[PDB]
């Protein structure tokens, strides 16, 4: 089935983080593609990917990178689609550089930014799901189930 | 004319920032409502607003607050809709508390976060528009026009 | 015996930190309950817990969470009881996000915030004790003993 | 009329902030004293103030200071009473030095810390009131009224 | 008279800072061009500017931007020329977002980064001059004179 | 021989850091005492230590602590002697809390602050030595030798 | 009348801060010299100033600079005398760059660092005085008087 | 062959980082020297190195250090050559101190600063290469090849 979400990441080293977005989309049965695209090492690959995303049928892009993390913002520069940004935890600055590089977009070109690291990757996929759910009733019910199970599954007290 | 986006903010002092989201939605002809909801002063008002948003026909919530900024995250706790968070600039810490208290959502409850301040409010509205544009071709055409005009309006050289 | 302190925490993963509050309360023989309550994954569980805390005989609530740590503040939103907040050390940002999310409450809804991590969990319990001690003479004497033993036990010089 | 809360601050320059704690205690009819005590300029005055607070009938101390803000922690060192700390905003570092030097107390000597600046001072007074309200029903009723009014006074929409 | 340095900046608001680079290059008689290029509003203009810089005879690019500052890094992605980045001071975060989003380039695509603000713009021009001075003896002599004058012009004592 | 430097530290856990000050003083044959003194757990022990330091023949105090690190400043509050402060690396905030708690002393009561961690402990001892050297010619020559050996011993190129 | 303290600063813009060190030394009758020395604009002037300070009869150097503040550390590199560093507040980063670039000296070359800004300058002078007071009884008596007056001059309550 | 790039570093402990610059220069066949030079422990060694660099035929200096990292800036103080600075990751502050110490140079004496850590060391060498490439066609072609291989080698999708 044709992908409706693109997951892109700046490097293989981001995969340990971005796999959490991939897994969540698969759990909810959201067809998606998962690609490496570097804003800096493959800038024309990025331009082409972002420019053609909509005509290819993508609805949402999830972009993850670390450091001077420009992949989400430059993707949003070329697509009208919603772009969600995952700050990957960097070694020295723990993703604060990633976070500021992604979230602080000037007015005109948005990136919806999620938490640093694996939680943000998971939430980027959930956010993409909640967007798709607006016009896909079956997916909306599966998302409702997912959220209900999350809530119901929280224990009442810690295990010691 | 029925609202499809809800803009909520923690206080009147947030309006100087959040008015930019309001203006952009009006510019793009996106029907919306604009409210004050305090996560800490009116927690039950928030619970009811967020719980009922989808059945009231809202598709996206834009939530803005500053300091220990819980409004977006708690909104997202109670709705299955996409929630976008605007960190309002705070006096002492310049919105860094706003930013971290909004963006660092743990796995399972996303908030799509935008830049600190007016830029973020503007971009929350643009991000909401790009979401709605996925299943509204007239709006998609208006957003394309808007993006194209932004691109065409950048000058080639500075004024000295 | 009926609990007079509630310890609540956002997740099982917080228990490694919050167990230090539990242990201290037990050492001082302060009856207490220890629960998982997520502001974001179980928001109605939190509303109910906080709303009914006083009528259930609780005097003080100790709430711990990490990241966008909204559990203490949203608990204080619904209870008139004093709420003490423990910032749990987060992976990337080392609890700075937890700290700012908890301590930077706007005027009107306070959270008494303790240090990031285990020391804060221990001190949240000691602070709760010092509050209860105001109207429980036996506990006040046990707290006096605890503080005296802490002081007396500090060695005069390091072991090499 | 005998004070049950002590407000102490490191300098006259702290009063612009700490006056908000004073006002709120008066509003709630909580008898209190308001003093300047410098941890570094009058360390013996501090030792004596804190040592004797409980026997003088104080139940809670609210301590405010900025920069390397030692006043709350050293107060807590010498009293068994609950000490609440207000980080006063500093010129260069905007109260981040105030905050960290107050909140990061090691295990065994708590300071319940509130927000940087006026909000924190207000909330220290509210937190002190919620503590006293535990064993003062008239005050508990006044605080409930106060909280309920805060909730009722939040508007539903912003003014443009 | 053909330009050997390109100064590019993300917006007119950057000119207050980047004008210092322009002035210093003129002072040292380094022919240059000064343009506005938005990484996010005119991404294809940027791609073309950077791709073609070397064949147009440019030797160094000085790029200035603020906030999530992608202009220097994306310029460097598309040119083999040395790119120098000037972090423009931002309103809320004082150029710390500018700084981290410029300097933290991952391995393989350098941006030589200068100080936040006017100093950085001035120093980008001086750094560009020292680069050009390597294979331009007349310019090398002008730069030596400039450095020597800077050294000679420092007073020996302050004015009171 | 009577100690002329006092090393004091807030806890046994600081010794891993403060031993570097001890070792340096011993290397230079500077008689000294090494003690645990907690500002918060043993405040009267600190008052007495600092108050009597000068009459006991101490010339310089080196004080190390972590977190809300008030030991150096409160020591300086009671002694006219120069106090040097060593920020101990804390677990969560890596000694930034220690650093700000120590260095940001208001005017009137100084603490000469050294680097976070072991380097600062070593340098506190070297700084104390350079102070004593002003009026002890033999020690001054041993310090000169120490500095000369440091300089001479730096290799010219790295070992691979 | 021969100077025993040298105050050096990187620029005239530093004088607004460093004048407080000058004033305090004059108040305590400590003969001193006050100079501008730029670590980066006059590196050989600095080398010569620092190399020769001890033979010229200086006992302590107070060095102030802002931004990438190398003046104190490089001074300490070339003198065996105690060097005290004053972080001058910087425009964008509020002296945090000044602070870290002064205090974080690696092992072997100390700089005793004081607070950001005017407080630090004042305290550098007081710290220098406490050093000199060790072997100057008349000065020791003046400093005691000064400290005692500071203590006596703290008011007991704020002015409203 | 005579070196045209000097790599200098403050300590053997920096070599784990700076070896990445060495390796890159060797890969591109750029003759270079690799030296330890401490700004603080060997200040005259630094003065001499920087002063004579140009007359020795060096074109670019790459300087790496950590903490109060003054090596790059003080090198630039004495040479007219372009100096590139590599912030070495420090233990406590993760190279934020290194970064600010290097990048925040006031106007007049530039250091082109690269990312914290190994990526910055690699990029300092690439930046030096892109400078040399301006007047060495063979090297320019080898750099073009290097950049082309980097781009071409990025995989299209992650390995799981
Ligand atoms: N910002 C960016 C642009 N292209 C890649 N990156 C990022 O560079 C970091 C390191 O990549 P690598 O490990 O391949 O050097 C990764 O987090 C990746 O997102
Ligand atoms: N803020 C919040 C709300 N609900 C849970 N959390 C926090 O999310 C973090 C991670 O939870 P988990 O490990 O279950 O993902 C924990 O520190 C927990 O307090
Ligand atoms: N600030 C302070 C006052 N008394 C002790 N500390 C500090 O508390 C930290 C932790 O002490 P402990 O490990 O005993 O809890 C140590 O760095 C010690 O200097
Ligand atoms: N800033 C500086 C001046 N001279 C050496 N350093 C730095 O000091 C740190 C620690 O050096 P060492 O390990 O030898 O103590 C290294 O990062 C080195 O660049």
Short mmCIF file of C-alpha atoms in Angstrom, two decimals, chain A residues 2 4 14 20 24-25 28 36 54 73 82 85 89 102 115 118-119 123-125 129 138 152:
data_model
loop_
_atom_site.label_atom_id
_atom_site.label_comp_id
_atom_site.label_asym_id
_atom_site.label_seq_id
_atom_site.Cartn_x
_atom_site.Cartn_y
_atom_site.Cartn_z
CA UNK A 2 1.18 3.54 -0.87
CA UNK A 4 1.08 8.27 3.59
CA UNK A 14 19.64 8.42 14.02
CA UNK A 20 10.44 4.18 17.48
CA UNK A 24 4.47 2.99 16.12
CA UNK A 25 3.28 3.62 12.56
CA UNK A 28 -1.28 1.41 13.90
CA UNK A 36 18.00 8.41 5.19
CA UNK A 54 2.75 15.67 -1.87
CA UNK A 73 13.11 22.82 8.66
CA UNK A 82 2.98 19.19 7.71
CA UNK A 85 10.60 17.25 13.80
CA UNK A 89 20.02 13.34 21.31
CA UNK A 102 14.42 22.46 14.96
CA UNK A 115 10.66 15.80 22.60
CA UNK A 118 12.99 8.18 21.50
CA UNK A 119 9.88 9.62 23.18
CA UNK A 123 5.20 10.97 19.57
CA UNK A 124 5.96 12.20 16.08
CA UNK A 125 4.34 8.98 14.80
CA UNK A 129 -1.57 9.33 13.29
CA UNK A 138 -10.82 3.15 10.68
CA UNK A 152 -5.95 1.69 31.04
#
